[PDB]
Design a protein around this ligand. Sequence first.
Ligand code: H52
Ligand code: H52
Lengths: 400, 398
Amino acid sequence: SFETRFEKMDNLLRDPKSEVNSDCLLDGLDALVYDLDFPALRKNKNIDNFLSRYKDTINKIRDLRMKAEDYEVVKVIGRGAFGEVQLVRHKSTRKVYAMKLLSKFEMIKRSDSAFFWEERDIMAFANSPWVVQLFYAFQDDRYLYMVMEYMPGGDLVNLMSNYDVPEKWARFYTAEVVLALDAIHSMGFIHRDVKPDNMLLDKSGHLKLADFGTCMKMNKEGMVRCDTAVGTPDYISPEVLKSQGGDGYYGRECDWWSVGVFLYEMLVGDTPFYADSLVGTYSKIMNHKNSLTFPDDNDISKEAKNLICAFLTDREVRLGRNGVEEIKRHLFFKNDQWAWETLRDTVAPVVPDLSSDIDTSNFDDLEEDKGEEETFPIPKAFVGNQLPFVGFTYYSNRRY
Amino acid sequence: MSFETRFEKMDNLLRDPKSEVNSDCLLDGLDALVYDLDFPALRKNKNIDNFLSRYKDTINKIRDLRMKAEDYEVVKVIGRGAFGEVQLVRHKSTRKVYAMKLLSKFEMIKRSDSAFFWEERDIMAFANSPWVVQLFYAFQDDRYLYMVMEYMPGGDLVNLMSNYDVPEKWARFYTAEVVLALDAIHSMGFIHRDVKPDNMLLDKSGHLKLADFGTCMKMNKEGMVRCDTAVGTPDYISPEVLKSQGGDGYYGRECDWWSVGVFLYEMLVGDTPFYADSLVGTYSKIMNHKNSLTFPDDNDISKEAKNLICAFLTDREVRLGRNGVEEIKRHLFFKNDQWAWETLRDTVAPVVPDLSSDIDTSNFDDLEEDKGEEETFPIPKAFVGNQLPFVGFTYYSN
Ligand SMILES: Cc1cncc2cccc(S(=O)(=O)N3CCCNC[C@@H]3C)c12
Ligand SMILES: Cc1cncc2cccc(S(=O)(=O)N3CCCNC[C@@H]3C)c12
């Protein structure tokens, strides 16, 4: 019909998940103008006319869309591999966020993933108390921007470094991680990178999973086919570490192995497979059968040792293989202060004491500025470097 | 300005029909970029190959839902333009009848002329005047631009002048309707620059509308325009525009009234006042208008008609219409006892067309057969950009 078509079209223009909604269409034009405004291409008639035809229109567009100078930087609080994360306040709304930056030139310069899509999709739609929420995402010719909620409590690395964690606490944080990963699994994802660095606490002291740069979608059988290893040297599982072209076909059990490494560190004080070098940890992990030993100290309860061992073993025997419910039924979690279905409603072991909306005490000092980072080379001919990052924007068509 | 304001100002721009960043214009820019990149030589670049591979399923579906050419059923060819034919069509779904104009993209690029359609698209779409032919829809593909307009069943004034010896009473009516039609186009801020019977069409009631505006321009601060172009049909073109060969000339809107004087002269005498065999001879007679403008040895033309034709066919600085349009209306030639200006298009027309159906094309002569195969674009080796001058043309109505 003539109306059914006009309707179907209006869906693809509004739906927050359309490949061509207002966010994607306003980006596509913004990408073209950016990737044409070079004197070596201005010699072409069509390009020179097009840029002069849209010059006044495109400068009005960029002044109205969300841009970097809309935010007031307060302090740098994190360093990612591709860009820093800074505590900012929106100049107009006065609201405080944690803004993440991603250098476009850097990611294009050999980072075989285009990973930002998976993290943008989860943090924006997950709608879970265990997942850090993405509020806005925008871009320009240099960086990608991810405006997320600020976690004032800090990461679990900072907590472990300033405390000797007792079992009561370890039980709480391990249980909150288990529910956090089960929520990510329900979305159809294997995390592949579970570690304290990616765990942050809110203003109440409860745990959330920040960063999802290594998340991948499971198939119908619930497995993942990968030819290259992914993760962190200490927390990586035996099957993900030996990932090769011969197969490389693992399930979600690898995530629970990392939770066992996480529990071991909170009690013992060190990683279960520490070494003098980095490549030593590798041999120690592949030989987990004989290398996994607890130090001579009576303070690790029988149950704690049992769970850590139930996680740190071969995939086929490893606990958590028959669903997440057999992990929750474990005796280590058997306590008398909370229940699973009401855990994030109970009072946290360490409640943070904050002075203001911008209290950054739980975050160690960084440097700021660094000068100016070099970006893409000025094109001689049409390169089209913004085409990969088209439609990353999350502003005009957000889900409410 | 607040954040709630900045967000909403942006959101309104995607629905505003006058906006250059409206939803249809943004959809054009993506539709275009896929055409001007999908060549096996440019697939070597991965940023392009990856961009095209993502929007495959998507851009194919977009080009399927939007208004396309096969949505209309062609009934008969009724007109021919420089860049493509104009055909009477019926929309297959709504069953409504329109006159659709076609413009070959490749042709406009080849002739180095792809910046005139904007002025006509803007007027016919927003003019909202009984004197202006209305544009309902405008869409495109990789080959032509499309302009869906209201069909004028009355035919052009050329066909009327060829089948009748136009009496003064009629000439008075049609000249007055042109004067009001041009005054409406002037109020929008435009000088027409191309007033002739070919561009005048009658509706089903027999009243005049200006169709085709492919040479209109926006007037500057003093209400004038500086331009430099060639000459197409110099029979109606004024002295000032002819002296503007280069861009050294600044002319006002009084050039449009000169053409109205040529229009009145033709309706009565029977021929153009400065006609010649060659194109350079027509020009020479226009420049020497003080001596070439004459009248036949038959006093069929009244005193008033002679006066008005002379008041229009003189130097710009003395030409009638310089001191506004009101001094033209006050002229004694128009002094009649049939109508008044403010109610003219409500009176009965001198020639009311007799129609048989919604597709009666009797007032339009049959048109040959173009037959000439349209040439296509050669496969690029770099970025050519043969779609950028045609982004933002698509337009829908409510
Ligand atoms: C400090 C911080 C504070 N508040 C919210 C955050 C949301 C995502 C990431 C961070 S972050 O910790 O800056 N961050 C990115 C740097 C790489 N290391 C992983 C880690 C999760 C936040
Ligand atoms: C026949 C016709 C019939 N109905 C509506 C029309 C609207 C615009 C142009 C035409 S048209 O006359 O086809 N036309 C274009 C060809 C060049 N000459 C100018 C003239 C106005 C219409």
